[PDB]
Amino acid sequence: AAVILESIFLKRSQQKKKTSPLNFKKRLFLLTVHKLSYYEYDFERGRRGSKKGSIDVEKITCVETVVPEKNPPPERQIPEMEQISIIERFPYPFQVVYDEGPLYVFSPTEELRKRWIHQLKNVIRYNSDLVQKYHPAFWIDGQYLCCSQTAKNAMGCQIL
Numbered sequence: 418a419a420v421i422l423e424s425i426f427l428k429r430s431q432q433k434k435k436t437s438p439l440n441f442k443k444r445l446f447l448l449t450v451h452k453l454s455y456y457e458y459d460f461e462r463g464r465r466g467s468k469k470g471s472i473d474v475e476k477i478t479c480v481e482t483v484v485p486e487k488n489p490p491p492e493r494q495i496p497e498m499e500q501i502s503i504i505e506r507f508p509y510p511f512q513v514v515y516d517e518g519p520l521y522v523f524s525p526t527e528e529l530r531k532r533w534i535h536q537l538k539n540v541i542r543y544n545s546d547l548v549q550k551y552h553p554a555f556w557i558d559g560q561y562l563c564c565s566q567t568a569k570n571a572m573g574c575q576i577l
């Protein structure tokens with residue numbers, strides 16, 4: 418359908434097991450009123466490559482910022498040459514909460530994260546399962562850092 422937003426983000430992959438070590442992938446994200454989709458970006462030709470996956474907008478319960486990592490690697494650190502840094506540095510995380518727990522996405526800028534959150538909140542406005550609570554920190558190594566709850570589906574420890 419009609420593309421609301423199109424961006425290059427760093428995403429934290431869903432793992433085989435919660436113990437398994439984290440993997441981050443650079444992908445192009447597409448937002449429509451029906452889907453949040455992601456692709457392997459074709460840099461050379463300047464196009465979206467292969468679709469890797471999608472989340473139905475109706476399945477989204479929450480969209481918020483996430484408290485940043487205590488000590489991120491350079492790829493997720495605050496930058497400097499604008500065209501370059503907007504595709505190399507991804508310091509601003511946000512979460513897309515759905516059926517299969519939270520999806521963690523890293524924006525190159527604060528402004529782009531704000532645009533994505535603003536638009537994602539609007540496309541989810543008429544959803545049923547919209548939660549009023551959320552986890553401000555990341556689920557990492559079998560637990561959320563903000564409340565120590567050990568279930569990805571656990572109810573939010575903070576009111577939004």
Ligand SMILES: *[C@H]1C(=O)Nc2ccc(Br)cc21
Nearest residue numbers: 430431453455470471472
């Ligand atoms: C990233 C991943 O590992 N799995 C998944 C599913 C849907 C989206 Br939009 C993104 C990701």
Ligand SMILES: [Mg+2]
Nearest residue numbers: 497501502505
């Ligand atoms: Mg560089």
Ligand SMILES: [Zn+2]
Nearest residue numbers: 552563564574
């Ligand atoms: Zn929490």
